[PDB]
Amino acid sequence: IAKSAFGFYLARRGQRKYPFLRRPHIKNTHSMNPSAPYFWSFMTAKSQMAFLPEENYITGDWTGKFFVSKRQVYTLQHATSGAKVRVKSFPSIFEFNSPSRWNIGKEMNTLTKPRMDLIDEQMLTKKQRLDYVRAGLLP
Amino acid sequence: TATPERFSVLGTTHPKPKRTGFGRNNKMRSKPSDNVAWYDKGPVEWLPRPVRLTYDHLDQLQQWTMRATLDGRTEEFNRIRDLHREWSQHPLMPVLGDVEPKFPLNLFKQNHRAKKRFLVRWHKANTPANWLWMPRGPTVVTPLHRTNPTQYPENWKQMVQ
Amino acid sequence: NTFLTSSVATPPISVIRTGPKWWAHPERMVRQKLMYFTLGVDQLPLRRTAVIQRDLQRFHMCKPPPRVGDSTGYKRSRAAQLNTWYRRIQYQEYHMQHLFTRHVWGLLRVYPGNTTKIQGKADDGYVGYDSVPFHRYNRAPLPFPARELYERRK
Amino acid sequence: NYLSEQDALYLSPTTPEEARVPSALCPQLSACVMVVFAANDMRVHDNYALALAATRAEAAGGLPVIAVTVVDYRMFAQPSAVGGFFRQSPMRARFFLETLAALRYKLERELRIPLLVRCGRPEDHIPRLVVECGAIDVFLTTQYAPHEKEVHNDIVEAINQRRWVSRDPTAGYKAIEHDAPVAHSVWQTTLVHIDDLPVPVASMVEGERWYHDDVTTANIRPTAAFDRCINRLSDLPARGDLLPTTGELSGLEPPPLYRGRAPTLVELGYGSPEAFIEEEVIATQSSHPPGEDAAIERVLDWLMDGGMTSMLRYGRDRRTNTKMYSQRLSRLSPYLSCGALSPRRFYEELRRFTSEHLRDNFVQQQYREALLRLSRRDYWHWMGLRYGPLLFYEYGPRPEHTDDIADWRHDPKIVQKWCAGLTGIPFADAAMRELTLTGFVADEGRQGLIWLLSRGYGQDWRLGAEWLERCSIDYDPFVCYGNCAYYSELVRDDFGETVRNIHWLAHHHDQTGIYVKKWLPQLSKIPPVYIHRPHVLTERMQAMHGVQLGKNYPYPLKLWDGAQYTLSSEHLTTYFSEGSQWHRKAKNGAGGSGYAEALRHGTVILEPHQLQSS
Amino acid sequence: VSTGEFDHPPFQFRQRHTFNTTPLHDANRFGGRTAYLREIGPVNIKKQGRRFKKDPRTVQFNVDVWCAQQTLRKRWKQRDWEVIEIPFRLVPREQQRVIPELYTDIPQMTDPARNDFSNIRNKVYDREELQGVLFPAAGAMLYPPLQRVDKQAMTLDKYL
Amino acid sequence: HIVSEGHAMPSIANEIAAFALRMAVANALVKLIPLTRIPLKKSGLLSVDRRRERGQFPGYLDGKKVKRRFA
Amino acid sequence: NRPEVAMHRNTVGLLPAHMWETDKKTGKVKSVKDSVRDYQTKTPYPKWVQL
Amino acid sequence: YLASSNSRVDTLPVERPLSHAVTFNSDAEAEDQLKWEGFYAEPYVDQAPTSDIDDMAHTFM
Amino acid sequence: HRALADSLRAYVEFSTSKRVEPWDARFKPFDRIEKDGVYVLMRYMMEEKLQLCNYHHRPVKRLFCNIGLMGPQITTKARWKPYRFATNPAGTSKAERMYQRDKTVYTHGHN
Amino acid sequence: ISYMEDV
Amino acid sequence: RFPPTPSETPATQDWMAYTAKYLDKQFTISAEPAPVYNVNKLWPMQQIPGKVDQTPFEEDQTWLLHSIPVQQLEMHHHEKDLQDLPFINHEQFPRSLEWNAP
RNA sequence: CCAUGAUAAGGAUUAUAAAUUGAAAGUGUUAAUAUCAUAAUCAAAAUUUAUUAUUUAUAUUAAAUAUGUAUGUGUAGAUAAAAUAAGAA
Ligand SMILES: Cc1cc2nc3c(=O)[nH]c(=O)nc-3n(C[C@H](O)[C@H](O)[C@H](O)COP(=O)(O)OP(=O)(O)OC[C@H]3O[C@@H](n4cnc5c(N)ncnc54)[C@H](O)[C@@H]3O)c2cc1C
């Protein structure tokens, strides 16, 4: 059960059908979907000639960003500079402490797994743990 | 980044066991269902597959029969006509009290799966081999079709004078 | 021919009870009549089906006849007897169609759909390029080429 | 020929390099404790031998554990004692091979214990494999059936002195030549282990009622300790070189010769599947998939659905007639026979379910009835052990009780008709159809069939027993033969269920005729008055109900008095004769499935028997 | 009037191969182009399947464009002729006029004065009559003159 | 001559359109010749059937006549 | 090249074999070595940037 | 096909075919003949016996 | 990263490796003996380029379109094996090969 | 009654 | 824009030129008689002269065997995008749908 | 949190005829009881939750970024819908 302010304000109204590609809250759970032949044409800008998004650059006289935007595309300088790179994700943040050259040119949201396979055994309740065991997700 | 051979938490994730069943809710078994056809009963497997005939098939058949007629090969025509003579007899009228069984009706909970199952099983059992209503065999008399290939028009040379 | 997907077979009652939609459809009926005519055999079962079906569709709209109510049940028995006789005639027509279609395909070297039998040179049943790696009825694997029921040269 | 090829490949005096167990790189891992899986058990959740091997390995000796199994070629296509039936029909062989494959998958992917499969004589293969692997201790389950007790004794004797075999001549070799092993035998077939019964088997009173009394005071060992011992194998190291690769797991390439390959039905000697395949209507919607996990899921789903009504109807303390048409009855007999599901696991699961749902007052009666059924199976096991080879002799185990039984008579046509199910009795027809098509038929069906063959017709009871062996996938030797003798009046024991007529059983268990209608739908129009006697019908009734005797439904084998004078040749409709459908059913023309099928359609036959036409 | 099907069948329960019912994308509907919109095998709605193939609007647009391609290819098959510019003086009398642009005025006629009521936008002239104007410097007539048949001639059709 | 009005489709080879053509021809013949009205009216040629396909409704699963799944 | 246009133009020269370690018995990629410290390039930006 | 002894009773009794009158004196006799031939029987095929209803009643009690 | 490298390697190797013949040998155009019919044209005219295209369905169909001498017979009358059946290697002789492909490779059904 | 046959 | 235009070939303009260049090298006539005036192969469309371009395909096979993609995302119109969807028909003023602006 | 009321879904007997097969008995947001309350989208986001028709084997990823998963005899239990331009007695 996701806990957020909008959860009380809005209502799911069951498994309602939305217009194609027009769900209100976008949750790209398929960003980390791997596809070798379609590596450059999945969750990425369609044209190779397009410039990098505005989110990859600093515009004004900034004082500092806690985390960079997900659409910011990983570049060589991200690994070469050896600086601190963080991306907001559940639960709190994901930090790039393993700079690799195999992710150059791909978006950080594509690199980061949205739906983490790991399940917390601590906050899980008795009934919820029983449900997970019945589903097979937990022993 | 020289992927280490020791993954700490990636391996320890309780791998999902393999799916047991199939179909709905992954619980259907592999039982031989009612869709199985019997290739022994009659030249056509019972509960025949929905074969659909096309006009290009009709044209190809016309070309084939033209070629056979022009080449004088009539064994295929004779075997087709004999098969039609054997399978195309007039069904005798059933006696009073002959009715195909019907499935009982209940109002509280009508089981449509059992309703279709009974019909499918009954018709599967009702193979063309044991269709006693349709006359068959050599003991029957057919005063509508030529009995032997000798009297067919392709053998017209014999009937003279 | 063009339909090579494994198919589900409906009961003959389910086929017959369909009105002038598929079973009694004029296009399919005239195609079957053309096939029978080209083969040269009489169309007695098809005509016996058509004469019943045209009257059935003519009178489908009106109400059933008023009846006083037969004490002996002779009228109900006679109605059931007529319905069964017509159903059996249509059964014979259905079997004739499904037999001569296979025979014509065998003569014309036409590869049929999955899991169907042609009395000429394929008695086990034809399975080729199916989603399952086996015959699904014999549970036996099949070669990568579908099969060669007929020779190469035409 | 396949057995000869396997003997030339494996049982050669020097094993070829293509068939070699790889040498362990670790000197301490060179030795490995070995466990052999027999046909009795194919499970790893409650097997005693595996747990004992695990605890021995974790205590001392060879830390790696190696699992082996041998599929003998002598009980698949070989003829039986009489009638030439397959010892295991193609359906039973397919079930066994699927169970073996599932067990191998579970062992090699969950426990990471390699399962070396061999084909041929276990007595020839197992000791040589132990010597080749250098096993410290070889564990196995006790086998005490004929053709199986002898092979178990030969295996243990050979491994005691490290004996070998040499190809076709089978020249036993000494331990010195090469290309302290001890054999442990543990008893796990029955629900309750020996030495735990309140009375010894030798002094056990002949009767199932007394054993039912005993089992109330008897104790059942908990399975938690054995489950722990089995689970410890995961942390216990094993030979990783024998673990399957991804390619052979997917089946891209055949498994290596030393790891073994499961045999195929065509190579086993069946030859003509189209002759043995039966195309008839199947009414039961429930089938048992192979696998111990599948068996556990079946038990759980049956308990959840509430199949206790099959054991006993709610509120009915007296045992009530069963309903074969229903899907409620628990079809765990094939699992118990093949050993995929242990009776101890069944008992503990059932007791746990009863303890949970103890609020209803009748669940105790349901549980006790199920325990009574399991105790009956154990009692038949004990009776088979007591009788030994004497049971399989002519006229049952105890001939003194068979004075009323007439001399056995043999008729190939009669036994062929009975096997094919062309009997005039609809109940017998339905029972035979379920037994042939489905994995098994219910207890009442088996009783009716065996009584009809033995007493109803006079044919030899061994024919029916061997046909049950061929067809029923839940086959247990002792249980099947003992029940056949009891219901043929060969083991005449009082204080037990009375032997009942086929007509009695049909009228009692299937009175309305739902089962008969379901399995013989061509008789659906027959009213419930004449369902069980379709023979007694006039021509008018036959025409009105759409069934003609002979043409559509066969005449009964045993005609009424004076029927031979009033019946002509046309009505009788001989089914097995020259030029008949049964004759042309097979491509080679040797009839079809039935009498002498192993002799007729058997590519490889070890025994000569007698082969004559008609 | 065309016997072809221009409409993509609506999405409903799974279609099984049988009589009167075939799979929605079984390589036969709308030609073989349904492979672009075919997703074979059982598919998890949770985490499998491209949504554009499940969107009725998009598949309708795709089948519309495929039908448009069929119409265009058949029209260009019909279009055996080609268009050549002529400076209004070497054209015949029927063309020495003002021709309104396409779809701008009433469909004109080819000089109804002499009982010629053809469509000026559809009339096609053959190369033989215009051979001289099209190839002024050719010299020798590369294309032979068109041998016209005399209708007044006494031939076999006139019941000789 | 027949002129189609309302909803135009490429192929109108269907029984409903054939019935509409039949009604139009019968009405035209009646208007042309007065005494022709009696046989056509007694045979039902001129009579109009008010039946029409059920209109769309998104509440239905297909939109016309089938409700949604219930538990 | 993407598969939809021309897979046949793919060649082994595209694959950098020195980037990863290859299994000998199966031809699989066992692992990929580090590619940051050992990577030296003279144009982190196109030559026309010139800072 | 087996026979049956006409003097001694065999272990399996097989019922002989029943005999029906070729002529009917009364309409009541004809109606009885039809009823016991099953002419007036519902063509429905039994799928659940009355034993289920009786067991439900017993459990309710 | 490891799986991406493996998938790229497998995809390139699959693209370069020769695949099975994508034409059905049971239909009207591809029915003649290998010594007659369209097979003579294939063997004597376009045989060289088939090895270079590695018998993939898209290049073979495009080459059949461009060679002419067949016209619309490659689409109006000819038929081809399904997408997952035309991707089998040069010698398969088994139906279940398509399920033997590696699963950890994220090549999107390209061996 | 739609179709009736003498035989 | 798709479909891509394949590279041109010298003697594929006509059968006479193709036979003369690629078949025999002895054909007397170089090519078909070309009129002195300009010929517009694609009559409705005015293409840039001197540019190699194709014509609508006469054959069916090339239409579905060419590199022609399919619609995947939402359809965008140069003007109808103001109106959100066919269901959400945004009308600024309640004027008639048959209204005219003189 | 609580802080009065109000619209929904749910077909069983008024029928042919110049005619419609959807109900009033109530469904989150709305008008009197108070007494720490800053919980609100303007993008790129976190399944464990009863109430939901997905495309099945000739040709398959181009424009806002848009689904890598589950081939297994049309296969247990349980259950859903329709007698209105359609064809059912
Ligand atoms: C001629 C004959 C042969 C038989 N052969 C076998 C055989 O090979 N294997 C076999 O397991 N049973 C055999 N039985 C016993 C009986 O057929 C089965 O117990 C039962 O019919 C199997 O169906 P079920 O599992 O649905 O029955 P359930 O009652 O649901 O099964 C309960 C379990 O209890 C045991 N059991 C119950 N009744 C008996 C019984 N009468 N005798 C022995 N065990 C019993 C079995 O292990 C059975 O699986 C035979 C009976 C007869 C008359």
Q: What is the DSSP string of D491-552?
A: S--SSSPPP--HHHHHHHHSSS-HHHHHH-GGGTTS-TTSSS-TTS--HHHHHHHT--BTTT
Rounded (5°) CA angle E32-E34-E38: 130
Residue J2 in tokens? 């739609």
Full 3-state SS string of G19-44: HEEECCCCCCEEEECCCCCCCCCCCC
CB H59 within 8 A of CB H51: no
Scored b (16 or more CB within 10 A) or e, E115-137 reads eeeeeeeeeeeeeeebbebbbee
User: How far, in Å, CA of I45 to CA of I48, rounded?
Assistant: 8
SS3 content of chain C, % helix, strand, coil (to 5): 45, 5, 50
Residue D257 in tokens? 């010769």
Which residue in I25, I27, I96 is closest to C133 by CB distance?
A: I96
Q: Does B10 touch chain G (CB under 8 A)?
A: no
Is the dihedral angle over the CA atoms D522, D526, D528, D530 positive or is it negative? negative
Q: Where are the alpha helices (DSSP H) in chain C?
A: 12-17, 26-39, 44-58, 74-108
CA distances from residue C65 to C68, C69, C75 in whole angstroms, order as listed: 10, 11, 12
Scored b (16 or more CB within 10 A) or e, D328-337 reads bbbbbbbbbb
CB D436 within 8 A of CB D421: yes
Chains A and C touch (3+ CB pairs under 8 A): no
Place of tokens 């293969």: D125
**Is the Cβ atom of A81 within 7 Å of strand L at any atom?**
no
User: How far, in Å, CA of D597 to CA of D415, rounded?
Assistant: 12
Q: What is the residue with the minimal CA distance to atom 11 of ligand 1? A: D333
The DSSP result for E89-113, as a single string, is SSS-GGGSS--PPTTSSS--BS-GG
CB D599 within 8 A of CB D591: no
Nearest one of D481, D189, D474 to D337, comparing CA atoms: D474
3-state secondary structure of D505: helix
Beta-carbon pairs below 8 A across chains I and K: 17
Alpha carbon D334 to its chain centroid, in Å, reads 7
CA distances from residue B62 to B85, C41, D553 in whole angstroms, order as listed: 21, 14, 43
Burial class, A78, CB count within 10 angstroms (exposed 0-12 / middle 13-18 / buried 19+): buried
User: How far, in Å, CA of A9 to CA of C41, rounded?
Assistant: 76
Burial class, H56, CB count within 10 angstroms (exposed 0-12 / middle 13-18 / buried 19+): exposed
User: How far, in Å, CA of D142 to CA of D188, rounded?
Assistant: 7
Full 3-state SS string of D540-607: HHHHHHCCCECCCECCCCECCCCHHHHCCHHHHCCCCCCCCHHHHCCCCCCCCCCCCHHHHCCCCCCC
Residue B77 in tokens? 């025509």
Which one-letter DSSP state was computed for residue E18? B
Nearest one of D459, D439, D249 to D336, comparing CA atoms: D439
Rounded (5°) CA angle G21-G22-G25: 145
Place of tokens 């020259």: D578
Phi-psi region of D101 (alpha: psi -120 to 50; beta: other; left: phi over 0): alpha
Q: Does A16 touch chain G (CB under 8 A)?
A: no
Which one-letter DSSP state was computed for residue B5? S
3-state secondary structure of D185: strand
Full 3-state SS string of D48-106: HHHHHHHHHHHHCCCCCEEEEEEECCCCCCCCCCCCCCCCCCHHHHHHHHHHHHHHHHH
| Radius of gyration in angstroms for the set of CA atoms belonging to chain H, rounded to a whole number | 20
Pairing of strands D33-37, C122-126: unpaired
Which residues of B in 34-73 have their CB below 7 Å from strand L's atoms?
34-36
Distance from CA of A121 to the nearest CA of I (A): 28
| Largest CA-CA distance found in chain I, in angstroms, rounded | 51
Which one-letter DSSP state was computed for residue D455? I
Which residue in K38, K41, K75 is closest to E61 by CB distance?
A: K75
D476 is in an annotated binding site: yes
CB D545 within 8 A of CB D534: no
Cβ neighbours, 10 Å, residue D280: 15
Q: Where are the alpha helices (DSSP H) in chain I?
A: 2-16, 38-44, 47-53, 57-67
Pairing of strands E83-84, G20-22: unpaired
Backbone angles phi, psi at D141, to 5 degrees: -100, 145
Residues 6+ apart with CB under 8 A from K90: K82, K83, K84
Which one-letter DSSP state was computed for residue C108? H
Backbone angles phi, psi at D409, to 5 degrees: -125, 145
User: How far, in Å, CA of C26 to CA of C29, rounded?
Assistant: 5
User: How far, in Å, CA of A85 to CA of A68, rounded?
Assistant: 7
Which one-letter DSSP state was computed for residue I97? G
Are G2 and A79 a contacting pair at CB < 8 A? no
Q: Does K65 touch chain E (CB under 8 A)?
A: no
Are I7 and A100 a contacting pair at CB < 8 A? no
Cβ neighbours, 10 Å, residue F53: 8
Residue C88 in tokens? 């059996």
Nearest one of D303, D301, D282 to D293, comparing CA atoms: D301
CB C23 within 8 A of CB E34: no
Full 3-state SS string of B48-112: CCCCCCCHHHHHHHHHHHHHHHHHCCCHHHHHHHHHHHHHCCCCCCCCCCCCCCECCCCCCCCCH
| Ligand 1 pocket mutation pick from D443, D473, D509 by most atoms within 8 angstroms of CB | D443
3-state secondary structure of E21: strand
Phi-psi region of D10 (alpha: psi -120 to 50; beta: other; left: phi over 0): alpha
CB D70 within 8 A of CB D126: yes
Nearest one of D44, D52, D62 to D100, comparing CA atoms: D44
**Is the Cβ atom of A56 within 7 Å of strand L at any atom?**
no
D326 is in an annotated binding site: no
Helix D477-487, helix D363-387: angle, nearest 10: 90
Rounded (5°) CA angle D445-D446-D450: 120
CB D218 within 8 A of CB D382: no
Cβ neighbours, 10 Å, residue C35: 21
Residue D115 in tokens? 């399962």
User: How far, in Å, CA of I32 to CA of I29, rounded?
Assistant: 7
Written as one letter, the residue type at C108 is L
**Is the Cβ atom of F19 within 7 Å of strand L at any atom?**
yes
CB G19 within 8 A of CB G32: yes
User: How far, in Å, CA of A86 to CA of A130, rounded?
Assistant: 35
Place of tokens 């000026």: E120
Nearest one of I16, A103, A47, A99 to G15, comparing CA atoms: I16
How far: B107 CA to L12 C1' (Å)? 13
CB B15 within 8 A of CB A119: no
Are B13 and A138 a contacting pair at CB < 8 A? no
Residue A23 in tokens? 């769900």
Are A138 and B14 a contacting pair at CB < 8 A? yes
Nearest one of D509, D491, D191 to D351, comparing CA atoms: D191
User: How far, in Å, CA of D185 to CA of D143, rounded?
Assistant: 9
Cα torsion E69, E75, E76, E82 to 10°: value is: -150
CB C8 within 8 A of CB B35: yes
Pairing of strands K39-40, E83-84: antiparallel
Compute the distance from residue D443 Cα to the ligand 1 centre, in Å: 6
Which one-letter DSSP state was computed for residue A81? S
User: How far, in Å, CA of F22 to CA of F15, rounded?
Assistant: 10
| Radius of gyration in angstroms for the set of CA atoms belonging to chain C, rounded to a whole number | 20
3-state secondary structure of D138: strand
Nearest one of D267, D240, D241, D263 to D20, comparing CA atoms: D241
CB C25 within 8 A of CB C57: no
User: How far, in Å, CA of I105 to CA of I3, rounded?
Assistant: 7
DSSP bridge partners of E109? E119
| Largest CA-CA distance found in chain C, in angstroms, rounded | 70
3-state secondary structure of D486: helix
Can the peptide bond before residue K3 be classed as cis, meaning omega within 30 degrees of 0?
yes
Which one-letter DSSP state was computed for residue K21? I
Distance from CA of D289 to the nearest CA of B (A): 7
Residue D592 in tokens? 């079809």
End-to-end CA gap in chain A: 21
D530 is in an annotated binding site: no
CB K31 within 8 A of CB K14: yes
3-state secondary structure of B130: helix
Residues 6+ apart with CB under 8 A from D570: D550
DSSP bridge partners of D558? H2
Written as one letter, the residue type at K76 is H
3-state secondary structure of C91: helix
Nearest one of D340, D353, D337, D344 to D302, comparing CA atoms: D353
Cα torsion D372, D377, D379, D384 to 10°: value is: 170
Distance from CA of A44 to the nearest CA of G (A): 15
DSSP bridge partners of D140? D185
Can the peptide bond before residue E136 be classed as cis, meaning omega within 30 degrees of 0?
no
User: How far, in Å, CA of B66 to CA of B69, rounded?
Assistant: 5
Written as one letter, the residue type at D392 is F
Q: How many residues does chain E have?
A: 160
Residue K98 in tokens? 């048959």
Method used experimentally: cryo-EM
Residues with CB under 6 A from ligand 1: D 329-333, 336-337, 373-374, 376-377, 380, 440, 442-443, 446-447, 450, 468, 472, 474-476, 479-480, 483-484, 487
Distance from CA of C73 to the nearest CA of J (A): 18
User: How far, in Å, CA of B81 to CA of D207, rounded?
Assistant: 69
How far: E61 CA to L51 C1' (Å)? 33
| Radius of gyration in angstroms for the set of CA atoms belonging to chain J, rounded to a whole number | 6
